[PDB]
């Protein structure tokens, strides 16, 4: 199936992103980084690999906050490059990666506008993977209703709002309900897109996107217990893609304690091993750490094919995890808290 | 006397009766078997009860067999051509009606099984709807019996 | 062996003997329905029924021999089901 | 989508006519028309031959073209981050060129066996001439389509080797075995096409 | 005589014109009107 | 009949090279361009 | 009470009985249908198997017939004794559950549940 | 004398009456049966009222049965080609009209069941909507009865 | 007496018995063998139990082979056109019924094995549903044996 | 003597035996090779164990070659139309069976090696599923010999 | 002597030689052109080096022209079907080979240009990979010259 | 002797010459104009220089006109089929070559124009690549003149 | 003397002359008009200027009319196939060239209006680009005027 | 004198004039109505003005009626095949030009109605756009009246 068309438009970008996939820190690379004693050594070790010169032309008194920014700067330049070079079948897929960041940027814009702040002050805080081309929303910024109309005109997000959130909803709902409701519409739409890109894309993407839908449902459930969210508000936010959708999604929505959530994970042996594999006790890996670990084990399956878009999405989420890893190593070193330095996730 | 090609249409009668019925029952079994497999995950109790659509889809294969055998055992070299057209008419009247019924059993069996996972009271409703699906094979059998013996 | 194989050999022994002896009888009475099972040839229509009757004896012996292998399987399996 | 629904639309409309036409010529008692014996005699043997020759090249070249661009576009892409790619992985292109070479070897042979008849009646043309025409067709079609498939295969698995080599230098030497098994398909498409041609003569 | 010629002329001209109508009709039937500033409202 | 030599051979060429043209036109109509450029 | 719902229920019941006098009357053809299938399967399963052991001599045929008959038994069990049995079983249940029972058995109520130590 | 192929259009009449009506009843049953199953979780009490679209889908297959039987009863080897075209016209007339009625019953049933669960008032409407679908099978039948008796 | 072209249909029977059952058994092996591989990562123990869809897919190709050999042994240089059509019928009737059975074995095998990985109780149901799929090949074989021996 | 065009169908048999086996062996090798190569980065030792799906795809190419050689050497301008059709049948039978086998070999080869490199215990199961893909080529070969040698 | 239509095939040869080579050159120029544009924004100095796949796509049109002219000069009213079919074989052999080679040059151009932008070491390799695709054009031209002069 | 019908192929020459050239020039103008418009919001000064793609698309339609008119001005009653098929081949050879050239002009015009607004140095490259596109229309013209003057 | 059926091709000329030109002008008016309406949301004043792509699309319909009238006024009972083919050719050449023009007018009218909304300098470029789309209708017309009067 | 199987073309003209014009008016209504409904949500007062694209689509049906009634009264038993072709030409030329006007109306209606609610000035411009769609029907009427009375 895919080989009739895939290399016609994507063969170069596939070879490029696979090149960037060779350019990753192995377990053996992390087992160098964690041995060193200061950010000057961290620079000198990272200097030996694809991160070379990421801290060039920068202040000698390094801070973990500068390392964080320059790690992301590499990732976002590589992504913007692949998005500029891609043709519409892939480029629409790469756009689907960027919505997961534009949602969070829109949450800042709505938050500042609801507090009457000028959006021009929020621009430097927006994630580079979600920066807009059209700016009249940013330039005008006058009221939440004006921003909502400007979003529908300017932003690719406009379709998601029309499916789930009116202007009147934006005036009343909390911004974190907005974040997850937009995300619900997003993940389901992107999963539908990946089911329409049948064969190798669908078979690489659906295991990941179905896991992300389950992951939101599990995590939102255990986080909701201490909160004003009703069982109906949980049900309104769980994404309908994941293996739980036929029943476990409703069972989570009814659930109100960790054991009742494990009673859903017990029906799905992957998830049973994730919850069994973390009590979140002192010195344990946490439930969250197992979700990040498993998401990496799924993203590692993307490169076991040759002709599909699953590599681009998995690559972004792996380099994102590489940034989170190197920042977490840099914190443990800078603060001397070596006792938890091993908690990075071994990407490849 | 009777045309040399005549038995070709009678053969396509028998063949269609079995072939399109096997496609109908295969679709019925594939879609409902998928629904059972997905439903079983959180329902060890319902796995046996849920076989209803699967076995019912098998009936369409048997209506196809009945007509196919009934035609096939009625073939001869001398066949009057009129009898061969009756046998085509029969073999399609069951065969494609069994395809229709198999579609309905497949879709209904899948949905009915998943809905029964969510709500065990649906088990009766599923049986009733599957009857209104399955009878489309039976009406195709009736017409094909009438035609294959007119 | 194990008990599973012995239980299989018991059931196979019983059904094999029961059926094959009934066939051996139906062959020895020269019953008309059995013709399709007999390995006759164009020459077996010469002279009279003596040729086909000899084949009914040979084929009846095939079934008695096969039933004998199911009796041997029986005796072996009735030991193994107790030994395992 | 659009052109697939057009190809399907034509394809279904065509077979919907052909079911009806085949029924009609049976039931109306018109088996004296649909004379496949007429089609296979009055269609000149030179047409079957020259479609065979033309497809023997062109389909081999179509397979070698996909062969080249499937491996080539991966060689280029990996080559950015791994310059070592741009020499060793070229062998997969050489096997795609070899699939075209197998085309031209076979098609020159078949071409250099064709000759003019000086007759136009199926009795006077006679079995030898027809059998040359049909054999050169089937042979030329067999090398052409076998090379079409072989070249696409060697392309695919040449991207195979290149995208793997980009991540580990050792892999190419071992992965190269699949390109050999791919390349054998085009060679089988020659051996049989020689045999299908080997006994013909026109005149 | 020449009935195959008339028939194939008519059949292939009418196939070509039927396709050029149907394809053109499809392209005009299913254009994106693209009224982006108002399509979301 | 509905066919004659020059027509039947004419179609077995034409309803072949029109398939070839459609493979050509499928690849040419598959041509696209990027909506973006680098900085 | 509602006259509207009374018409809905009584119409559904009347329609199910009137249409049932076509469909349910035809439904028992299932019996013939599966019976024919069973008979055919049994004849094929004999014919494709047992005849391999039906050699022209006592010893040469009887030795093969032992293993050939074991394959025959295995297939006739799995297909007929198990699955076509399970078919007939489930079909006959359906015939009871609807075509028989729908004339008279409402089949709506709570299951009685005796409290007991036997549930331990 | 009448051409020996004349019965072919008659048996295609009977086949089309059955087959396309079973296709319509199958689609009408499959969509509405999905609607019932997916509805059952939120409103288990509505299953027994919600069968009505399924029953009306079943009725479309009965329209096809009736005409396929009437056609079959009227066939003979010696049939005048005129009567066989009437039977084809009757067959397609009920058969494809029942396909149309079945398409409508499927879409209306799925929307109608899922709507009714959120708002019971819809029922009084959707039964009348379903009547205005099912009557297409009746018009196809009326034409097919006229045609098959000219 | 008999057309020289007559054996062409009987050859297409022998061919189609094998061709369409090979396609059916290939798809049945391809679809289910994808599922077995995906499953085995989580449940290494279930590999040997999960082969059964593939074994039944093999059996569909055996039904193809049976008729294909039975027809190819029955063919002859002057075969009566009647028997040539009966053989085409046998070939299609096993072959496309084999295809349908292979589709069912494929879909049911994939779904059944993945579901079994999540719920070991599904294994019983999966085998039963697979027999209801695989028997469609056997029903095609019945009609094909009848037609080829009639 | 024989008809003038007689050898054409037998030539299409030799071509179809190869062409559809080149399609089958190509897809089987191409899909398997993408699996082998993409997999090998994760497990560089497993290439040798993982070549086997490609060797199976080469074996179904041999089946197409063997039949196409036998057809091509059996052909002559003097060939009777009967053997020209048997050869067409052998050619479609092996060719499309090898196609089916190759399609399966490609799917189960790729899924098999990808599974194996995550969980090495799959290998013993992968070999068995590949045998049940490749043996369809062998049933294609068996039929094609039994036709073309008759 | 020769048929009235005989020259038509040789004329379609002359046309196909140009038309399919123009299609191949057009795609090859369109993809390379798009590559150049989206490279030049970042590496303006590489335009004059990177036009290479465009001139090579232009050369694949020239290969069609050479044959189209050589066929057109070889035509006459009285042309025997032999020479007319040789010219049609020439027309495909250059034309569709140019269509093929042109697609490889277009895609390898679009990759090669966007690769070279990031990696100056590619520029030799890209031209080696493109020269293989141009020789695919020669493998059309060479036989089309041989056929036209026969 | 000259047959009837003959002027049809020569007319379809004069049609195809114009029609497929107008389609080439329309696509070439449509993509180029999209490029100019979507570009010229940012760089209005580049409107005038960026017309060149549109002018070269216009030239492809002129090559179509020239051949169509040359054919039209040399159609005659009772034309031999030789000259008439030459006129067909000429009209296709410009028309479809100009179609291909038009796709190249369109794609290169759109990529080159929107690229040039980011990077002025692209302009000289774009003109050269547009010449390599536009010349395909000239090759279609040269062949069409040659054929239409035999 | 001259055949019946002769007028058919000339009538398909008058039909194609009008139908394909109206399709062209309809696409050009549709795509341009949706652009104008969408544009006016931002710009209240540009409407009476931005109408011009619709007016040039209107001209394409007039080209179809002119030829369709000339054809329709030329036809008679006794007309020779030669003048009839010329009338088919004329009607196709204006028809499909007016379609090609209309396709380009729609795309460049829409893009030109949208760009003009953000940047008023584009209007001059939009008119020039549009003249190079509109003239394709005029070339279609010129060929069709020649052919229909030859 | 005149053949039968002849008034058929003029009858398909009478039908086509109405059928394609109804399809044109139906698309022209279906989009325009979706526009009017979606628009009315925020601007209820505009309905009695924004109905115009629907009224224009209604006039396209009336153009179909006028030609279909004209042909239906112009037919006679044994009509000269020449006038039967002219009426087929008329029936396609109004029918499909009405269909083209219907497509244009449907698009500019759905855009222009939405646009008019966001931009109250647009309404005059929208009518001046719609006139250039509706006149495509009138051009199709003109040629169809010429042909049907020629």
User: What is the extent of the structural domain holding C56?
Assistant: 1-84
- Kindly state the tokens that stand for A183: 């995300």
D188 and J18 Cβ atoms separated by less than 8 Å? yes
Q: Residue B45, SS3?
A: coil
Q: Measured between CB atoms, which of L85, L93, L136 is closest to K26?
A: L136
Put simply, the chain G residues between 4 and 23 with a CB less than 8 A from any chain H CB are: 8, 12, 15-16, 19, 22-23
Determine the residue among B1, B4, B5, B96 to mutate to test chain D binding: the one whose Cβ has the most chain D Cβ atoms within 10 Å: B5
* E36/A152 Cβ within 8 A: no
Touching K (3+ Cβ pairs <8 A), the chains are A, D, F, L
Say how far apart CA L146 and CA D94 lie, in whole Å. 38
Tell me the two tokens of residue B63.
């209506």
Contact flag E33-N27 (C-beta cutoff 8 Å): no
Instruction: Tell me which chain M residues have a C-beta less than 8 angstroms from the C-beta of L148.
Output: none
Angle between helices D171-197 and D122-165 (to 10 degrees): 180
Resolution in Å, one decimal place: 3.8
Token pair 């059995």: residue? C34
Q: Kindly give, in sequence order, each residue whose CB lies less than 8 Å from that of residue D35, ignoring residues fewer than 6 positions away.
A: none
Close Cβ partners of D38 (under 8 Å, ≥ 6 residues apart): none
Q: What size, in residues, is chain N? A: 150
Q: What is the CA radius of gyration of chain E?
A: 19
Residue by residue, DSSP assigns A123-189 as GGGS-GGG--S--HHHHH---HHHHHHHHHHH-TTHHHHHHH--HHHHHHS-HHHHHHHHHHHHHHH
Q: For chain M, first and last CA: distance in Å?
A: 21
Rounded-to-integer distance, Cα M40 and Cα M36, Å: 6
Q: Which residue has the tokens 């009213």?
A: K77
CA distance B33 to B37: 6
Cβ contact H29:H54 at 8 Å: yes
- Whether residues M111 and L33 touch (CB distance < 8 A) is answered with yes
What is the rounded distance in angstroms from the CA atom of residue I19 to the CA atom of residue I58? 13
Rounded distance between C-alpha atoms, residue C83 and residue B40, angstroms: 39
| CA–CA dist N1, J136 (Å, integer) | 65
Tally of structural domains, chain I: 1
Cα radius of gyration (chain C): 17
Question: Which chain E positions have a beta carbon within 8 Å of A159's beta carbon?
Answer: 40
Largest distance between two CA atoms of chain K: 66
Contacts of M86 (CB under 8 A, 6+ apart): L7, L11, L75, M147, M148, M150
Which 8-state DSSP code applies to residue A173?
S
Q: Say how many CB pairs under 8 Å bridge E and L.
A: 5
Cα angle D81-D85-D89, degrees, rounded to a multiple of 5: 150
| Residues of chain E neighbouring F1 (CB-CB closer than 8 A) | 3-4
Q: Report how far residue N150's alpha carbon sits from residue M77's, in angstroms, rounded to the nearest whole number.
A: 10
The residue length of chain J stands at 150
Q: Which residue has the tokens 């929303």?
A: A137
Q: Which is nearest to L128 in space by CA: K138, K23, K57, A86?
A: K57
Whether I and G touch, i.e. at least 3 CB pairs below 8 A, reads as yes
CB-side neighbour CA atoms (13 Å) of A135 = 8
Quote the tokens at residue E34: 């693209």
Residue of J nearest to A4 (CA): J27
Say if residues L88 and L13 touch (Cβ distance below 8 Å): yes
Residue appearing with tokens 């799906």: J53
Q: What SS3 class is residue H48?
A: helix
Dihedral (Cα; L136, L137, L142, L146), 10-degree rounding: 120
Give the other-Cβ count within 10 Å of C36's Cβ: 10
Give B-chain residues touching A247 at CB under 8 angstroms: 42-43, 117-118
Please tell me the experimental approach by which this structure was elucidated: cryo-EM
Residue D146 phi/psi, 5° resolution?
Answer: -65, -40
CB-based contact, J117 to chain A, within 8 Å: yes
Helices (H), I1-150: 7-40, 47-50, 52-74, 81-118, 122-149
| Contacting residues for A233 by C-beta, under 8 A, at least 6 apart | A177, A224
CA-based nearest residue to L143, from K59, K15, F17: K15
* I75 φ, ψ (degrees, to nearest 5): -65, 150
K37 touches F35 (CB < 8 A): no
Q: Which two tokens stand for residue H148?
A: 């098959």
Q: Which of A17, A7, A38, A11 is nearest to A319 (CA)?
A: A17
Contact assessment for residue J88 and residue J11, using Cβ atoms and an 8 Å cutoff: no
Whether M33 contacts N107, CB under 8 Å: yes
- CB-based burial label for D76 (10 Å; 0-12, 13-18, 19+): buried
> For chain D, how many helices (H) and strands (E)?
7, 0
If one counts every other C-beta atom within 10 angstroms of the C-beta of residue A192, the result is 11
Domain ranges of chain E: 1-41
Tell me if L143 sits within 8 A of K69, measured CB to CB: yes
First vs last Cα of chain F: how many Å apart? 67
Answer yes or no: are the C-beta atoms of I39 and J117 closer than 8 Å. no
The total number of residues shown for chain A amounts to 348
Closest among B35, B24, B33 to B57, alpha carbons compared? B24
- Residue L80: how many other CB atoms lie within 10 Å: 16
CB K102 within 8 A of CB D61: no
Q: Whole-angstrom Cα distance, residue A248 to residue A261? A: 9
| Structure token pair of residue B39 | 């439903």
Burial string for G54-72 (b: 16+ CB within 10 Å, else e) reads: bbeebeebbbbbbebbbeb
Q: What angle do CA E17, E18, E19 make, to 5 degrees?
A: 90
What is the distance between the alpha carbons of residues L87 and L148, in angstroms, rounded to a whole number? 5
Tokens 């051949």 -> residue: L67
Asked if I5 contacts J8 with a C-beta cutoff of 8 angstroms, the reply is: no
Conformation bin of residue D198: beta by default, left when phi > 0, alpha when psi is -120 to 50 = alpha
Closest in D3, D33, D47 to F26, CB measured: D3
Q: For helices I81-118 and I52-74, what crossing angle results, to 10°? A: 170
**Residue H4 gets which letter from DSSP?**
G
Terminal alpha carbon distance of chain L: 19
Q: Report the distance separating Cα B89 and Cα B83, nearest Å.
A: 10
D29 lies within 8 A of chain B by CB: yes
- Sequence-ordered list of residues with C-beta below 8 angstroms from that of D174, at least 6 positions apart, any chain: J40, J47, J48
Tally of CB atoms within 10 A around L136: 34
Distances in Å between the Cα of A156 and the Cα atoms of A102, A132, A338, D93, M32 are 9, 9, 44, 42, 24
Chains I and J touch, using 3 or more CB pairs below 8 Å? yes
Q: How many CB atoms are closer than 10 A to CB K49?
A: 14
Q: Tokens 């070479």 belong to which residue?
A: D101
Residues of chain D with C-beta less than 8 angstroms from the C-beta of J29: 153, 157, 178, 181-182, 185
Chain J, nearest residue to A306 by Cα:
J34
Which residues constitute the domain of residue N112? 1-150
E touches which chains (3+ CB pairs under 8 A)?
A, D, F, L, M, N
> CB-based contacts of D79: which residues, under 8 Å, 6+ apart?
A15, D85, D86, K115, K119, K121, K122, K125
- The residues, ordered by sequence, that sit 6+ positions from N132 with a Cβ below 8 Å of its Cβ are M25, M29, M54, M55, M57, M58, N104
Q: Is the Cβ pair J33, D134 closer than 8 Å?
A: no
DSSP-based three-state secondary structure for M92: helix
Chain D: nearest CA to E40, how far in angstroms? 25
């Amino acid at each position: 199936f895919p080989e009739l068309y895939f290399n016609v438009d994507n063969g170069y970008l596939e070879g490029l992103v696979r090149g960037l996939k060779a350019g990753v820190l192995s377990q053996a690379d992390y087992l160098n980084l964690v041995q060193c004693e200061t950010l000057e050594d961290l620079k000198l070790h990272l200097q030996s690999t694809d991160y070379g010169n990421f801290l060039a032309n920068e202040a000698s008194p390094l801070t973990v906050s500068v390392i964080d920014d320059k790690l992301k700067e590499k990732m976002v330049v590589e992504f913007r490059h692949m998005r500029n070079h891609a043709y519409e079948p892939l480029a629409s897929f790469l756009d689907f990666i960027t919505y997961s960041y534009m949602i969070d940027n829109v949450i800042l814009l709505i938050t500042g506008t609801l507090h009457q702040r000028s959006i021009a002050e929020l621009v430097p805080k927006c994630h580079p993977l979600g920066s807009f081309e059209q700016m009249e929303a940013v330039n005008i910024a006058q009221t939440p209703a004006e921003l909502y109309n400007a979003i529908l005109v300017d932003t690719p997000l406009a379709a998601f709002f029309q499916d789930c959130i009116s202007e009147q909803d934006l005036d009343e709902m909390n911004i974190e309900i907005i974040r997850n409701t937009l995300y619900k519409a997003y993940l389901e739409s992107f999963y539908k897109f990946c089911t329409l890109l049948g064969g190798t894309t669908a078979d690489a993407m659906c295991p990941i996107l179905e896991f992300e839908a389950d992951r939101r449902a599990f995590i939102i459930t255990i986080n909701s217990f201490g909160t004003e969210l009703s069982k109906e508000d949980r049900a309104k936010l769980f994404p309908h893609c994941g293996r739980l959708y036929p029943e476990g999604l409703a069972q989570l929505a009814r659930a109100d304690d960790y054991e009742q959530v494990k009673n859903v994970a017990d029906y799905y042996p992957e998830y049973k091993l994730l919850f069994e594999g973390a009590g979140s006790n002192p010195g344990d890996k946490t439930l969250e750490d197992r979700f990040f670990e498993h998401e990496v084990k799924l993203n590692k399956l993307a490169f076991l094919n040759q002709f599909h878009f699953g590599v681009f999405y998995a690559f972004v989420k792996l380099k994102e995890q590489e940034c989170r890893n190197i920042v977490w190593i840099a914190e443990c070193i800078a603060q001397r808290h070596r006792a938890k330095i091993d908690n990075y996730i071994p990407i490849f | 006397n009777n045309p040399e090609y005549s038995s070709f249409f009678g053969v396509m009668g028998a063949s269609s009766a079995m072939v399109f019925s096997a496609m109908g029952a295969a679709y019925g079994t594939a879609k409902s078997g998928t629904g059972i497999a997905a439903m079983s995950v959180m329902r060890p109790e319902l796995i046996m009860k849920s076989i209803i659509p699967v076995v019912m889809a098998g009936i369409i294969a048997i209506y196809g067999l009945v007509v196919a055998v009934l035609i096939a055992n009625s073939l001869t070299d001398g066949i009057t051509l009129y009898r061969s057209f009756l046998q085509l008419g029969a073999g399609l009247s069951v065969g494609l009606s069994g395809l229709a019924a198999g579609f309905a059993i497949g879709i209904v069996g899948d949905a009915g099984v998943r809905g029964t996972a969510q709500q065990p009271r649906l088990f009766v409703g599923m049986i009733l709807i599957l009857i209104f699906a399955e009878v489309l094979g039976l009406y195709g059998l009736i017409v094909a019996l009438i035609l294959s013996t007119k | 062996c194990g008990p599973k194989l012995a239980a299989c050999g018991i059931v196979l022994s019983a059904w094999g003997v029961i059926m094959l002896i009934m066939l051996g009888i139906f062959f020895n009475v020269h019953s008309a329905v059995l013709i399709e099972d007999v390995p006759f040839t164009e020459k077996d229509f010469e002279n009279g029924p003596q040729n086909i009757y000899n084949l009914y004896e040979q084929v009846s012996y095939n079934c008695f021999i096969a039933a004998g292998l199911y009796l041997l399987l029986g005796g072996f399996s009735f030991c193994q089901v107790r030994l395992n | 989508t659009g052109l697939e629904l057009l190809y399907l639309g034509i394809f279904v409309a065509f077979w919907a006519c052909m079911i009806v036409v085949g029924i009609c010529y049976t039931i109306f008692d018109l088996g004296f028309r649909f004379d496949v014996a007429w089609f296979l005699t009055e269609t000149s043997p030179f047409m079957w031959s020259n479609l065979g020759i033309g497809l023997a090249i062109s389909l081999s070249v179509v397979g070698a073209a996909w062969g080249i661009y499937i491996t080539g576009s991966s060689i280029i892409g990996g080559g950015v981050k791994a310059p070592r790619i741009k020499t060793k992985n070229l062998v997969s292109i050489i096997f795609c060129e070899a699939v075209a070479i197998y085309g031209i070897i076979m098609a020159i042979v078949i071409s250099n066996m064709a000759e003019p008849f000086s007759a136009t009646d199926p009795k006077a043309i006679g079995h030898r001439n027809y059998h040359a025409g049909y054999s050169m067709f089937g042979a030329g079609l067999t090398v052409g389509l076998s090379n079409l498939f072989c070249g696409v295969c060697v392309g695919i698995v040449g991207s195979g080797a290149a995208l793997a080599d980009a991540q580990n230098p050792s892999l190419f030497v071992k992965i190269l075995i699949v390109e050999i098994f791919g390349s054998a398909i085009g060679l089988f498409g020659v051996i049989v096409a020689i045999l299908q041609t080997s006994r013909v003569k026109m005149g | 005589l020449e009935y195959s010629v008339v028939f194939n002329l008519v059949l292939w001209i009418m196939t070509g014109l039927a396709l050029a109508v149907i394809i053109t009709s499809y392209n005009i039937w299913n254009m994106d009107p693209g009224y982006d500033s108002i399509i979301y409202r | 009949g509905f066919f004659s030599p020059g027509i039947w051979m004419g179609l077995l060429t034409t309803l072949f090279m029109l398939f070839i043209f459609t493979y050509g036109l499928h690849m040419i109509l598959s041509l696209k361009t990027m909506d973006r450029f680098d900085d | 009470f509602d006259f509207g719902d009374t018409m809905v229920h009584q119409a559904i019941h009347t329609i199910e009985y009137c249409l049932g006098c076509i469909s349910n009357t035809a439904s028992y053809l299932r019996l013939w249908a599966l019976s024919l299938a069973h008979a055919q399967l049994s004849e094929v399963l004999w014919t494709m198997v047992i005849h391999i052991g039906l050699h022209v001599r006592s010893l040469a045929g009887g030795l093969g017939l032992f293993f050939i008959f074991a394959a025959f038994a295995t297939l006739t069990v799995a297909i007929l004794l198990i699955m076509e049995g399970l078919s007939a079983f489930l079909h006959a249940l359906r015939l009871h559950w609807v075509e028989f029972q729908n004339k008279f058995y409402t089949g709506t109520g709570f299951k009685f549940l005796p409290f007991s130590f036997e549930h331990i």
